[PDB]
Amino acid sequence: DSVECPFCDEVSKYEKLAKIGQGTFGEVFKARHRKTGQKVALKKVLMENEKEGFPITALREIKILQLLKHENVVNLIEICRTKKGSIYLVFDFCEHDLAGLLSNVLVKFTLSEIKRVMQMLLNGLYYIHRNKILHRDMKAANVLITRDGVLKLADFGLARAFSLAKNSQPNRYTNRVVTLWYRPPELLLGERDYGPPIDLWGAGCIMAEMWTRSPIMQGNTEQHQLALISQLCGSITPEVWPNVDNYELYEKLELVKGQKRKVKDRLKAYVRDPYALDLIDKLLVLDPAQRIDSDDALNHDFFWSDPMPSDLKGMLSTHLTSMFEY
Amino acid sequence: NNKRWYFTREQLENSPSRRFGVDPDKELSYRQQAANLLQDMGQRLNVSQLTINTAIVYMHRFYMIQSFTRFPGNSVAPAALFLAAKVEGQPKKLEHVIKVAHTCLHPQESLPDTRSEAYLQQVQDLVILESIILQTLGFELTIDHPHTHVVKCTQLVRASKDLAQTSYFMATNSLHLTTFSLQYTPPVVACVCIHLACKWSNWEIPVSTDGKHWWEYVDATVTLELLDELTHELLQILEKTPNRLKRIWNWR
């Protein structure tokens, strides 16, 4: 027979449409409420092996999405079952993502619009950080925008909660997180007591990506990355980055010794505005404790200069009526 | 919203189990029994009381939707616990929780062949049940407990260590023995725990310099009249519980 279930609707009440994102631990359809036409995104809980009942990392994600209710963070509407069995995460549908826009050449951003995007992106980071959450997966692909031009951070699959590390016991978080290209130096050198700044780095890589239309530092492996970074920010030394020696991989990874900071310069050609440059710079700072934070970044003169942040709705509609996603 | 898992006295009366032949009295004991099973298991599996409480809350809420006649306490508990453990950052391995559950319910029998079909089925059985639990709870697994406020609520009346201890005991037994957690917010239950703890320890909480009673600093909705009714129900069932009261009795 059947079991009572008042608080978990069958996913049948949504009509699948098209596979929109093929990320890791994410099989993302689009869907339509069979009654209201309301569009949603369905993330089916992978259960590849999971020989330990419901996937804990899934429980983690679920706890987090429920806690984050904010305008620049994706929205979990509910959770649905199938009646083996399957579990679906249901979110408010958003029509574009930053990856789909930056690649499509039919799309162009004015300086002011770009300002709004970053303003929205940094504000969202301020929120989650204020809620002691790390996103740990910063990349254009995980940044969505609705029809009405609202930016929303998404995919908290890798996200985890963080604590104030005192009592003489540094944290042991997982080290191999966030995509390679958008990954920060602290993690490559094998840090396990990292914090908010790791997402800020990601945010840096995105800023540039707004003008360059392409992930600025593409690396084959963790070694090719670290070099590629140093070839933009300069050489990793105790002079520029105090106590960077303590890492077991410091030069025990054959790091390139001769490099001077060539960030502003290598970018001037793409981004013209001197303010934008100055920000991208304080975001792509090597030493995490010297890298700019969500709060201060917002207060940067960039967000307060003649070309003031604009709303995006007009562009999105006039631009294309289609949704940009791989 | 935030009232879904809180019920009225009439609602508790007309439970899912009532509608299948179960007397109020019968049912309340099924709960206590499940709680006991949990407490026992959790100790053996070496999880925090916090975890065991979360389990107990899951169990309570669960049987406000499902009936004991369809789901026997003995099968739901291990699943509830298993879930609570993962949820609270103390995961226990599935086999590990089945073993312990077995020995508690059948202290004599020996564990089946971990290769047999019998065993494999009770493994699938628990995973299924944990699923049903998740669904019945609408995947709302973040729980808040009186103990959080009772550490802060005792600090608020500058209580003795003994009076504090005693308070926690009330707190935890309230969870096992009564359905308070299905009726009153954690803050409130904490007050009920402390009030009774005073009455038991012949401790008198001094009225504020204003005239306000200590509980108004915790949950405005709390009236002495209520506290007196709850502490009465709580003490009543405690007295019926063997050896329980003995643990806080002043013997000197």
Author numbering:
A (entry chain A): 6 to 88, 96 to 338
B (entry chain B): 8 to 259
What does the study report here?
By soaking DRB into preformed CDK9FL/cyclin T259 crystals, we aimed to exploit this stabilizing effect to observe the CDK9 C-terminal tail residues. The resulting crystal structure, solved at 3.6 Å resolution, shows unambiguous electron density for the inhibitor and 11 additional CDK9 C-terminal residues as compared with the structure of CDK9FL/cyclin T259. CDK9 adopts a closed state upon DRB binding in which the N-terminal lobe is rotated by 8° with respect to the apo or ATP-bound structure. The CDK9 C-terminal sequence makes no direct contacts with DRB. Phe336 inserts into a hydrophobic pocket just before the hinge, and Glu337 inserts into the ATP binding site. The orientation of the CDK9 N- and C-terminal lobes induced by DRB binding is characteristic of protein kinase and protein kinase/substrate complexes that are poised for catalysis. Taken together, our results suggest that the bound state of the C-terminal tail and the associated kinase conformation observed in the CDK9FL/cyclin T259/DRB complex represents a conformation that is adopted during the reaction cycle. We propose that the DRB-bound structure of CDK9/cyclin T reported here represents a short-lived conformational state that is adopted during the phosphorylation cycle. The C terminus transiently folds over the ATP binding site, thereby stabilizing the N- and C-terminal kinase lobes and promoting ATP binding.
